[PDB]
Amino acid sequence: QDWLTFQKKHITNTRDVDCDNIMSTNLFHCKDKNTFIYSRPEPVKAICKGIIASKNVLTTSEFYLSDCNVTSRPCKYKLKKSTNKFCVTCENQAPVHFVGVGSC
């Protein structure tokens, strides 16, 4: 919904996201999936440079992604690492929503 919340929800400082731990917190409340971007914030913010009105943008470069995908056991996850482009909603020059992997 805003750049502060996007960083908390979708940017990780460690590739090996501790899914069963973090996914169980209020922010994610045991949901089935969450894509995290392994980067410091500024190169991710930079995806949106110059874009004022809300617009979905597919990244120009690929990033390191870490996904927490639920297993058959509620709130227990597999961590899956991949490299791909992703789509975010840019608004007033920052990412405010994560849209999806690979395509808008």
Write the CATH number for 28: 3.10.130.10
Given resolution (angstroms): 1.5
User: What distance in Å separates the CA atoms of residue 95 and residue 57, rounded to the nearest whole number?
Assistant: 9
Q: What is residue 46's DSSP assignment?
A: G
Q: Quick check: is 29 catalytic?
A: no
31 has binding-site annotation: yes
Side by side, the strands of the sheet bearing 55-58 are 55-58, 86-91, 94-101
Q: Quick check: is 97 catalytic?
A: yes
User: What distance in Å separates the CA atoms of residue 30 and residue 91, rounded to the nearest whole number?
Assistant: 28
> Which one is catalytic: 20, 93, 97, 104?
97
Domain count, the chain: 1
Domain containing residue 101: 2-104
User: What distance in Å separates the CA atoms of residue 91 and residue 62, rounded to the nearest whole number?
Assistant: 21
Please tell me the experimental approach by which this structure was elucidated.
X-ray
Would strands 86-91 and 94-101 be described as parallel, antiparallel, or unpaired?
A: antiparallel
12 has binding-site annotation: no
Amino acid at 92: N
DSSP-based three-state secondary structure for 9:
helix
35 has binding-site annotation: yes
